[PDB]
């Protein structure tokens, strides 16, 4: 019989314009359609272009809109060309193997493949429960076994919208 | 804690190579993203000693080391 995960997981994929696709693929319940789904999928160190894998529970969209990311945020490691591979794998192993220990605080993990470095993050529900976010980050140090003096950042996900004002640098 | 919790040597652990693809990933949209024979867990395959440099000295990006 099939091990449980404490919670559906549900996995997408997107493909940037060189356009967010973010299509879902298939959703699990166990560890055993886990491994089906995952061993049957590229590395995200092999896609070519800007790609992005999403993993989330089921019920929660890759998106800060969805009603459980729009007060929420997530921790952000920028990686060197050819880690995030093994970076994705323990990082999503420690997720749903319930590893974070924060409660129902996480939503869900990206891999981001880009041209000269990989962006991989994982997204909590509540951005002001310093508790959960600092439990997180020091989760990440040890699953991901960072070095010390590595660098990461915490964004929230409302502080990343462009608006008047907040616009970034744009063309005249 | 959580009702249901996995370590990282059982999630492997539990890992069996099954050549069926799921049908999901069959889709056209995801032919970049299809692999048809299996791929074990990286955890298993050795390091090589260059993947062992990076990961015990530096990981970050030059892109972010810039914004220092």
């Known amino acids: ?172 | 804690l959580a009702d249901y919790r996995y370590g990282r040597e059982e999630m492997l652990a539990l890992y069996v190579k099954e050549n069926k693809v799921p049908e999901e990933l069959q889709d056209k949209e995801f032919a970049a993203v299809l692999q048809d024979e299996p791929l074990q867990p990286l955890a298993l395959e050795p390091l090589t000693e260059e993947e062992q440099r990076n990961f015990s000295l530096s990981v970050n990006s030059v892109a972010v080391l810039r914004l220092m």
């Open chain 1, 1 to 172: 019989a099939e091990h449980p995960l404490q919670y559906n997981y549900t996995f997408w994929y997107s493909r940037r314009t060189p356009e967010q696709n973010i299509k879902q693929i298939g959703t699990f319940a166990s560890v055993e359609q886990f491994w089906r789904f995952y061993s049957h999928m590229v590395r995200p160190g092999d896609l070519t272009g800007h790609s992005d894998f999403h993993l989330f529970k089921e019920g929660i969209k890759p998106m800060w809109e969805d009603d459980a990311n729009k007060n929420g945020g997530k921790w952000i490691i920028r990686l060197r060309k050819g880690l995030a591979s093994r970076c994705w794998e323990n990082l999503i192993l420690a997720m749903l193997g319930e590893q974070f220990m924060v409660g129902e605080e996480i939503c869900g993990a990206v891999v981001s493949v880009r041209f000269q470095e990989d962006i991989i993050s994982i997204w909590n529900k509540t951005a002001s429960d310093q508790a959960t976010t600092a439990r997180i980050r020091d989760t990440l140090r040890r699953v991901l076994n960072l070095p010390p003096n590595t660098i990461m950042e915490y964004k929230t996900h409302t502080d990343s919208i462009k608006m008047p004002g907040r616009l970034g640098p744009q063309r005249l």
